[PDB]
Design a protein around this ligand. Sequence first.
Ligand SMILES: *[C@@H]1O[C@H](CO)[C@@H](O[C@@H]2O[C@H](CO)[C@@H](O[C@@H]3O[C@H](CO[C@H]4O[C@H](CO)[C@@H](O)[C@H](O)[C@@H]4O)[C@@H](O)[C@H](O[C@H]4O[C@H](CO)[C@@H](O)[C@H](O)[C@@H]4O)[C@@H]3O)[C@H](O)[C@H]2NC(C)=O)[C@H](O)[C@H]1NC(C)=O
Ligand SMILES: *[C@@H]1O[C@H](CO)[C@@H](O[C@@H]2O[C@H](CO)[C@@H](O[C@@H]3O[C@H](CO)[C@@H](O)[C@H](O[C@H]4O[C@H](CO)[C@@H](O)[C@H](O)[C@@H]4O)[C@@H]3O)[C@H](O)[C@H]2NC(C)=O)[C@H](O)[C@H]1NC(C)=O
Ligand SMILES: *[C@@H]1O[C@H](CO)[C@@H](O[C@@H]2O[C@H](CO)[C@@H](O[C@@H]3O[C@H](CO)[C@@H](O)[C@H](O)[C@@H]3O)[C@H](O)[C@H]2NC(C)=O)[C@H](O)[C@H]1NC(C)=O
Ligand SMILES: *[C@@H]1O[C@H](CO)[C@@H](O[C@@H]2O[C@H](CO)[C@@H](O[C@@H]3O[C@H](CO)[C@@H](O)[C@H](O)[C@@H]3O)[C@H](O)[C@H]2NC(C)=O)[C@H](O)[C@H]1NC(C)=O
Ligand SMILES: *[C@@H]1O[C@H](CO)[C@@H](O[C@@H]2O[C@H](CO)[C@@H](O[C@@H]3O[C@H](CO)[C@@H](O)[C@H](O)[C@@H]3O)[C@H](O)[C@H]2NC(C)=O)[C@H](O)[C@H]1NC(C)=O
Ligand SMILES: *[C@@H]1O[C@H](CO)[C@@H](O[C@@H]2O[C@H](CO)[C@@H](O[C@@H]3O[C@H](CO)[C@@H](O)[C@H](O)[C@@H]3O)[C@H](O)[C@H]2NC(C)=O)[C@H](O)[C@H]1NC(C)=O
Ligand SMILES: *[C@@H]1O[C@H](CO)[C@@H](O[C@@H]2O[C@H](CO)[C@@H](O[C@@H]3O[C@H](CO)[C@@H](O)[C@H](O)[C@@H]3O)[C@H](O)[C@H]2NC(C)=O)[C@H](O)[C@H]1NC(C)=O
Ligand SMILES: *[C@@H]1O[C@H](CO)[C@@H](O[C@@H]2O[C@H](CO)[C@@H](O)[C@H](O)[C@H]2NC(C)=O)[C@H](O)[C@H]1NC(C)=O
Ligand SMILES: *[C@@H]1O[C@H](CO)[C@@H](O[C@@H]2O[C@H](CO)[C@@H](O)[C@H](O)[C@H]2NC(C)=O)[C@H](O)[C@H]1NC(C)=O
Ligand SMILES: *[C@@H]1O[C@H](CO)[C@@H](O[C@@H]2O[C@H](CO)[C@@H](O)[C@H](O)[C@H]2NC(C)=O)[C@H](O)[C@H]1NC(C)=O
Ligand SMILES: *[C@@H]1O[C@H](CO)[C@@H](O[C@@H]2O[C@H](CO)[C@@H](O)[C@H](O)[C@H]2NC(C)=O)[C@H](O)[C@H]1NC(C)=O
Ligand SMILES: *[C@@H]1O[C@H](CO)[C@@H](O[C@@H]2O[C@H](CO)[C@@H](O)[C@H](O)[C@H]2NC(C)=O)[C@H](O)[C@H]1NC(C)=O
Ligand SMILES: *[C@@H]1O[C@H](CO)[C@@H](O[C@@H]2O[C@H](CO)[C@@H](O)[C@H](O)[C@H]2NC(C)=O)[C@H](O)[C@H]1NC(C)=O
Ligand SMILES: *[C@@H]1O[C@H](CO)[C@@H](O)[C@H](O)[C@H]1NC(C)=O
Ligand SMILES: *[C@@H]1O[C@H](CO)[C@@H](O)[C@H](O)[C@H]1NC(C)=O
Ligand SMILES: *[C@@H]1O[C@H](CO)[C@@H](O)[C@H](O)[C@H]1NC(C)=O
Ligand SMILES: *[C@@H]1O[C@H](CO)[C@@H](O)[C@H](O)[C@H]1NC(C)=O
Ligand SMILES: *[C@@H]1O[C@H](CO)[C@@H](O)[C@H](O)[C@H]1NC(C)=O
Ligand SMILES: *[C@@H]1O[C@H](CO)[C@@H](O)[C@H](O)[C@H]1NC(C)=O
Ligand SMILES: *[C@@H]1O[C@H](CO)[C@@H](O)[C@H](O)[C@H]1NC(C)=O
Ligand SMILES: *[C@@H]1O[C@H](CO)[C@@H](O)[C@H](O)[C@H]1NC(C)=O
Ligand SMILES: *[C@@H]1O[C@H](CO)[C@@H](O)[C@H](O)[C@H]1NC(C)=O
Ligand SMILES: *[C@@H]1O[C@H](CO)[C@@H](O)[C@H](O)[C@H]1NC(C)=O
Lengths: 125, 121, 121, 121, 458, 48, 48
Amino acid sequence: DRLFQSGGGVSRPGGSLRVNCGASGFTVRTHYMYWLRQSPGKGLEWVAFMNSGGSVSYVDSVRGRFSVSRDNPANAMVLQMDALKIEDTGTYYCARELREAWYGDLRDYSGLDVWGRGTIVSISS
Amino acid sequence: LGAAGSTMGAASMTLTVQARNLLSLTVWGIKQLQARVLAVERYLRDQQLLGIWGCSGKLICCTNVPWNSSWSNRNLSEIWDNMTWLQWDKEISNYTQIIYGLLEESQNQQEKNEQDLLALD
Amino acid sequence: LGAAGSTMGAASMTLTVQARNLLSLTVWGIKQLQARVLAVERYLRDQQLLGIWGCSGKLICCTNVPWNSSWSNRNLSEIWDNMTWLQWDKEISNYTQIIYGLLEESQNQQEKNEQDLLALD
Amino acid sequence: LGAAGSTMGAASMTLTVQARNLLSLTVWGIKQLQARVLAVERYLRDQQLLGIWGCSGKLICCTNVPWNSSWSNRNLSEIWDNMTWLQWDKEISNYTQIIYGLLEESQNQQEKNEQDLLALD
Amino acid sequence: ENLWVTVYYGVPVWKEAKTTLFCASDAKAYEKKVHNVWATHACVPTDPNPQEMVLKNVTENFNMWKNDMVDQMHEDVISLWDQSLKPCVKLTPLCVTLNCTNATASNSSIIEGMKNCSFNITTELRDKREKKNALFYKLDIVQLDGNSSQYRLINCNTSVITQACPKVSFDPIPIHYCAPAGYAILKCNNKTFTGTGPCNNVSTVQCTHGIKPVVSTQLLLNGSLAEGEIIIRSENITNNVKTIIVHLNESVKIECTRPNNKTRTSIRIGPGQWFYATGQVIGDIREAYCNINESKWNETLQRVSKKLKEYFPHKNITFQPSSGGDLEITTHSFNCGGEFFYCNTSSLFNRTYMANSTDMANSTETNSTRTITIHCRIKQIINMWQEVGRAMYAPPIAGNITCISNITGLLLTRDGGKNNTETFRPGGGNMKDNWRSELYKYKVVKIEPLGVAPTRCK
Amino acid sequence: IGPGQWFYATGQVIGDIREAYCNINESKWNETLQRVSKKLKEYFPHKN
Amino acid sequence: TELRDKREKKNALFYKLDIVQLDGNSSQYRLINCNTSVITQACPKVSF
Ligand SMILES: *[C@@H]1O[C@H](CO)[C@@H](O[C@@H]2O[C@H](CO)[C@@H](O[C@@H]3O[C@H](CO[C@H]4O[C@H](CO)[C@@H](O)[C@H](O)[C@@H]4O)[C@@H](O)[C@H](O[C@H]4O[C@H](CO)[C@@H](O)[C@H](O)[C@@H]4O)[C@@H]3O)[C@H](O)[C@H]2NC(C)=O)[C@H](O)[C@H]1NC(C)=O
Ligand SMILES: *[C@@H]1O[C@H](CO)[C@@H](O[C@@H]2O[C@H](CO)[C@@H](O[C@@H]3O[C@H](CO)[C@@H](O)[C@H](O[C@H]4O[C@H](CO)[C@@H](O)[C@H](O)[C@@H]4O)[C@@H]3O)[C@H](O)[C@H]2NC(C)=O)[C@H](O)[C@H]1NC(C)=O
Ligand SMILES: *[C@@H]1O[C@H](CO)[C@@H](O[C@@H]2O[C@H](CO)[C@@H](O[C@@H]3O[C@H](CO)[C@@H](O)[C@H](O)[C@@H]3O)[C@H](O)[C@H]2NC(C)=O)[C@H](O)[C@H]1NC(C)=O
Ligand SMILES: *[C@@H]1O[C@H](CO)[C@@H](O[C@@H]2O[C@H](CO)[C@@H](O[C@@H]3O[C@H](CO)[C@@H](O)[C@H](O)[C@@H]3O)[C@H](O)[C@H]2NC(C)=O)[C@H](O)[C@H]1NC(C)=O
Ligand SMILES: *[C@@H]1O[C@H](CO)[C@@H](O[C@@H]2O[C@H](CO)[C@@H](O[C@@H]3O[C@H](CO)[C@@H](O)[C@H](O)[C@@H]3O)[C@H](O)[C@H]2NC(C)=O)[C@H](O)[C@H]1NC(C)=O
Ligand SMILES: *[C@@H]1O[C@H](CO)[C@@H](O[C@@H]2O[C@H](CO)[C@@H](O[C@@H]3O[C@H](CO)[C@@H](O)[C@H](O)[C@@H]3O)[C@H](O)[C@H]2NC(C)=O)[C@H](O)[C@H]1NC(C)=O
Ligand SMILES: *[C@@H]1O[C@H](CO)[C@@H](O[C@@H]2O[C@H](CO)[C@@H](O[C@@H]3O[C@H](CO)[C@@H](O)[C@H](O)[C@@H]3O)[C@H](O)[C@H]2NC(C)=O)[C@H](O)[C@H]1NC(C)=O
Ligand SMILES: *[C@@H]1O[C@H](CO)[C@@H](O[C@@H]2O[C@H](CO)[C@@H](O)[C@H](O)[C@H]2NC(C)=O)[C@H](O)[C@H]1NC(C)=O
Ligand SMILES: *[C@@H]1O[C@H](CO)[C@@H](O[C@@H]2O[C@H](CO)[C@@H](O)[C@H](O)[C@H]2NC(C)=O)[C@H](O)[C@H]1NC(C)=O
Ligand SMILES: *[C@@H]1O[C@H](CO)[C@@H](O[C@@H]2O[C@H](CO)[C@@H](O)[C@H](O)[C@H]2NC(C)=O)[C@H](O)[C@H]1NC(C)=O
Ligand SMILES: *[C@@H]1O[C@H](CO)[C@@H](O[C@@H]2O[C@H](CO)[C@@H](O)[C@H](O)[C@H]2NC(C)=O)[C@H](O)[C@H]1NC(C)=O
Ligand SMILES: *[C@@H]1O[C@H](CO)[C@@H](O[C@@H]2O[C@H](CO)[C@@H](O)[C@H](O)[C@H]2NC(C)=O)[C@H](O)[C@H]1NC(C)=O
Ligand SMILES: *[C@@H]1O[C@H](CO)[C@@H](O[C@@H]2O[C@H](CO)[C@@H](O)[C@H](O)[C@H]2NC(C)=O)[C@H](O)[C@H]1NC(C)=O
Ligand SMILES: *[C@@H]1O[C@H](CO)[C@@H](O)[C@H](O)[C@H]1NC(C)=O
Ligand SMILES: *[C@@H]1O[C@H](CO)[C@@H](O)[C@H](O)[C@H]1NC(C)=O
Ligand SMILES: *[C@@H]1O[C@H](CO)[C@@H](O)[C@H](O)[C@H]1NC(C)=O
Ligand SMILES: *[C@@H]1O[C@H](CO)[C@@H](O)[C@H](O)[C@H]1NC(C)=O
Ligand SMILES: *[C@@H]1O[C@H](CO)[C@@H](O)[C@H](O)[C@H]1NC(C)=O
Ligand SMILES: *[C@@H]1O[C@H](CO)[C@@H](O)[C@H](O)[C@H]1NC(C)=O
Ligand SMILES: *[C@@H]1O[C@H](CO)[C@@H](O)[C@H](O)[C@H]1NC(C)=O
Ligand SMILES: *[C@@H]1O[C@H](CO)[C@@H](O)[C@H](O)[C@H]1NC(C)=O
Ligand SMILES: *[C@@H]1O[C@H](CO)[C@@H](O)[C@H](O)[C@H]1NC(C)=O
Ligand SMILES: *[C@@H]1O[C@H](CO)[C@@H](O)[C@H](O)[C@H]1NC(C)=O
């Protein structure tokens, strides 16, 4: 399995950007996927999560501004980002998680096993 | 539905109107079935009263039964001119059953017997 | 109800009698519905057998179907004089279905076709 | 059941066929009742449409209603020769309701009124 | 030049319509006086005669992807499985702190969590509680949110768990379907019907053949065979979210077995209640497995690929094992012998197919001696696909288990991307796509016997 | 309470304390009840 | 709850008019209706 990313780039505050995350060896649409970001020299932080079912949860700080969508023909996800702020500047990562939830109910948990190399996003004036 | 307050002669013009409307999950389920079956039962009762009276497919049918003056003394003009069927039914209610009894056999069953006798060898 | 033990000719005089009586909370509720619907079904089956046979509104109807001597050899006098419909039905039971098949189309459907042909241009 | 793909003239020969088949514990119990009552309701609706149209006991009946050329321009030969009732119904669907409205009273109710007038004094 | 109105009654004319269909059963009764099978299938009018009538010069469209009856079938299965557990015992007094070490019979190594799971049970005077023990297959046990010596039932903080009752053990019963009066069931009767478009071959029946309520994961089993060649049906082949259906024309025998035995034991609960569990295990340890004919599998999937490349009329084809999620969507689940099985099928879809490169077939694989073998695990507590929030427990079956089945079809999904090529892997999950795989031959219509036309009379 | 059962209750109360109340237009109430009385005295066609 | 062996001490608030003093020490209290009738919680989807 592998993940590969594209997009990101440069934007003024209030602009819009978009990052693609495509998979190989497995399809996005049937796994647990995570969007995270890391500001330079700082730690990782959660951004978005999409379950196997396709429902998405957002962290409060980007709700109403970030949106994730499935691109099944491309076997990928897309993070669309609008109303960009300075705080959104950093390196973004798309990742796959392996868990065990038998008959719904869970028993076992590995963590994040597949990690994309990250895309750079810079919001500046 | 709309001729009630009218005179009998007037109301007679529109009868198919009623003919159309006479017919056609544990709280209401039993209820709906009871209602629908009751509707079927009443409609078929009326159809059977026709079948014995003849006049099966005719909303109006005229037949050989003489009318009793003792049931009412009123003139045809008076009865068809300025009265509603509501009032008429009220007056006739008492003799209604006797009328039904006479009309059921003396009219139609004598007819059937004598009719097959006519064609009889 | 009261002519069974009588002779066929006698029993024939009283037929509307049956005609009147042929028709019309979790333990009995389903039961009542089943019974009422069954009654409706049987009555309508008979009505449909008439509708195909014609004779819709006539408890007696005579029509162009010749009788087979092979079904029975008995005299009309013998059959109508001193026999109950109970016994008659027993003898005819075997050919009843064939009789129904013949009477259903050869009599009435040929009639309909040839009749509209008569009025046809 | 077996004349659908046939031409209208052909299909007309066999109609009693449909006439016979048109009619006749908590999971299915309610279901069976719903189905049977629905069947009764549809059959009686059709019977009532006849009763208002007349033609009660006749699978074919011809009556005084002129046909509109605007509903269709096709020849009788063309319509009865090489078409299925499926297609015919599709073309007539739009004017079906108007046809029913006209046939329901202008034909049969005018008939009843004028007929009793003829026998009237 | 006279054209008057005429009416006909009894016209052979119909329309597509939504309605309710009714079950019909076989002559042999269940004879167990159970509400959900006997009073639901064995009390239903039996042996309907499919005196089918073929129709000359008739054309009709059949949409198997959109129809109105598959839902009812889903509906009935859910209703039955709900009714099944109505009268038998709940296990609420059981989900308690479990003290379970790991041991086994003669030599411990295999458990895998089962042996001597101990628990306190108060029975039957509600004052004299006793210490009992029993074995539960490891995958049904969770570690308690605390000390590792403590364990819990898998589902008990979340849902109610019920034991299945011995008279209610449900095996497939072929269900026929009948329409009410005024309604008719039509079959496209084609040998190459793909599930859409017009069909120049129509007949009608008063009754459909029996279809068994078989619950399945990926593979299609106990099913009917295609008449001609293997047939591939998809709502939209170019859409990547649409499940692909493979209907074989030749069955493939699969043989599964649980070769060990288990001694059934019972712990009383109260007045008419007992929890059934595994006692001693006898005697040798082997994992349950399944066996397949290599060559048949092989030629089969080859023809599958040759037919599949039609819908993607281009570059080569690749199969992959399952990808991930709950093993439900990744393994082969079934219920042979009343116990529930999950087989890792990854070894089965590890092939590729090229164009004209090489076709060495002198092999004839080998003297009927290359049986493909696959490992399986089993379980007891079942959150059936039918519902969430109500788990079924299953009692162990003493002795061993054999089960033999026919393989008839496949439920695949796809993936776009990789280089220039197409990739597929077993999909499944949706129960309806099971039943949609056999109801695809039927449509229901309503009969409107009133019609009008011109004639020359008056 | 158990597998699918929970009792719902009041936790912390926030933040200031006022008794629940209802508000009405005096004049409308007033003219209203006056007309009510004027109509009522018909059925008791007498003293106040 | 929920292992029917590990009972816990909880607390919550009930509007006073719903509480009665127990037939004994004033520190003890009882639900208003519970010696007499069955009390049921209303379910969120069924709010009518
Ligand atoms: C279609 O799908 C089903 C599901 O796997 C398969 O049906 C199985 O078929 C086998 C063989 O016919 C059945 O095995 C038989 O079981 C009988 C007992 O079953 C009853 O009792 C058990 C508890 O003991 C209940 O759980 C069960 O529900 C039944 O109530 C045995 O009596 C049989 O033995 C008889 O036949 C053998 C010879 O075969 C004799 O030697 C014996 O003396 C005896 O006469 C037999 O063991 C199995 O029960 C069926 N399961 C189900 C769920 O129906 C089909 O194989 C499958 N077909 C295809 C093509 O896929
Ligand atoms: C449209 O497609 C349908 C098929 O879906 C087809 O209907 C089938 O027609 C064939 C030939 O006309 C039928 O074959 C025979 O039919 C008789 C009675 O219908 C059966 O008794 C026969 O059974 C014996 O013969 C078989 C060999 O022919 C044996 O294999 C069998 O074991 C019996 O010994 C035989 O089936 C067939 O029955 C029907 N289908 C059904 C369900 O009845 C139709 O002909 C096609 N044509 C058109 C123009 O649409
Ligand atoms: C209870 O279960 C444990 C866990 O399976 C059983 O013992 C385990 O045996 C395996 C097989 O070797 C051990 O895994 C590996 O062992 C090697 C050394 O043998 C070690 O170097 C590896 O790091 C790895 O752990 C496992 O450690 C071992 N666990 C324990 C706790 O001993 C055990 O036999 C079962 N039965 C009991 C404890 O009664
Ligand atoms: C059973 O179903 C198959 C398809 O599932 C039917 O095959 C269909 O046959 C018709 C007529 O032969 C085809 O129409 C033709 O299309 C070609 C173009 O491909 C055109 O050149 C012809 O003039 C004609 O229009 C139709 O395409 C074909 N179906 C498909 C999906 O291609 C078959 O007729 C059915 N009946 C049987 C086998 O008895
Ligand atoms: C199920 O359907 C398959 C797919 O059609 C049937 O496969 C048939 O298998 C035979 C045996 O290999 C094939 O014969 C070969 O045909 C090719 C040309 O097609 C020829 O070049 C070879 O020399 C050899 O004769 C046959 O072609 C093939 N069918 C087709 C359409 O190619 C299989 O028989 C069916 N089985 C059942 C039980 O329905
Ligand atoms: C069956 O599936 C195929 C492939 O998924 C469908 O074709 C695709 O349909 C989508 C939706 O209409 C097209 O997306 C559109 O792309 C244009 C490109 O400019 C864009 O402007 C639109 O906003 C929209 O995103 C897609 O291009 C098209 N691709 C191909 C190769 O046809 C087809 O519609 C499906 N058929 C049915 C009946 O659902
Ligand atoms: C179709 O059935 C054949 C029947 O054996 C299976 O393919 C077989 O796969 C085995 C193991 O990969 C092959 O053994 C290997 O052979 C190669 C030379 O071909 C050798 O370099 C390896 O060291 C090993 O011995 C076997 O030859 C091969 N036989 C054939 C006839 O293909 C397999 O089960 C099926 N094919 C596929 C693609 O799954
Ligand atoms: C309501 O009552 C009046 C009077 O009783 C009816 O008046 C009749 O009106 C029709 C049409 O206008 C005349 O032809 C009659 O000669 C009137 N009769 C009398 C006695 O005035 C009126 O028809 C009644 N309405 C209905 C619906 O019956
Ligand atoms: C019972 O049987 C006797 C004899 O079979 C019937 O007697 C008939 O009586 C009527 C009226 O009294 C006469 O007109 C007949 O001539 C008698 N026939 C014979 C053969 O005696 C009597 O009618 C039968 N009762 C019923 C109700 O049918
Ligand atoms: C199917 O279609 C053909 C042609 O449309 C019909 O052929 C008719 O066959 C009958 C009896 O063999 C002839 O009397 C007609 O003259 C034929 N008509 C034509 C146009 O060929 C055939 O009847 C149709 N089948 C059905 C059941 O309707
Ligand atoms: C589960 O049962 C085992 C088996 O007895 C308990 O292990 C015992 O623990 C006590 C307490 O330390 C020791 O004194 C015994 O020697 C142990 N016996 C064995 C055979 O290991 C274990 O404590 C139990 N777990 C509980 C009660 O939570
Ligand atoms: C049944 O419950 C009893 C009571 O909690 C358990 O026995 C206790 O076990 C602990 C740990 O081993 C001891 O410290 C206590 O002294 C024990 N008390 C009594 C009264 O036995 C027992 O382990 C439980 N057994 C099962 C099978 O659940
Ligand atoms: C497993 O597959 C092989 C080949 O796929 C089967 O071999 C068959 O053997 C019979 C007997 O000579 C031949 O008539 C068949 O033609 C062979 N099949 C094929 C596809 O060539 C073998 O029978 C299969 N095993 C079982 C148990 O059926
Ligand atoms: C009438 O029945 C008698 C038997 O009682 C028989 O003798 C006679 O031949 C029959 N046919 C007649 C009288 O034509
Ligand atoms: C009958 O239909 C034909 C079309 O086939 C048409 O030419 C003709 O005018 C129509 N009317 C007749 C023959 O009166
Ligand atoms: C009937 O009305 C429908 C709905 O407007 C229309 O689609 C159809 O073309 C009409 N047909 C005729 C013959 O008027
Ligand atoms: C039980 O809990 C205590 C509390 O911390 C812990 O020290 C001890 O190791 C636990 N025992 C086991 C077997 O987990
Ligand atoms: C086609 O098959 C060849 C080997 O035969 C393989 O190397 C190649 O990747 C495949 N290409 C496509 C586009 O499927
Ligand atoms: C299964 O049980 C039967 C009956 O007790 C016994 O004869 C047989 O040997 C057992 N088989 C295994 C594999 O334990
Ligand atoms: C149990 O095993 C024996 C021998 O291995 C075998 O004869 C028997 O059929 C098996 N029974 C089942 C139900 O698997
Ligand atoms: C009621 O709750 C909302 C949301 O927690 C809070 O903003 C508001 O101030 C509260 N009002 C009072 C009167 O407590
Ligand atoms: C009527 O109203 C007067 C004041 O206006 C009051 O004093 C008196 O008690 C009332 N009397 C009666 C009989 O209602
Ligand atoms: C509790 O009961 C004892 C028994 O008489 C009594 O003395 C004591 O005052 C009581 N406490 C309260 C708070 O009522």
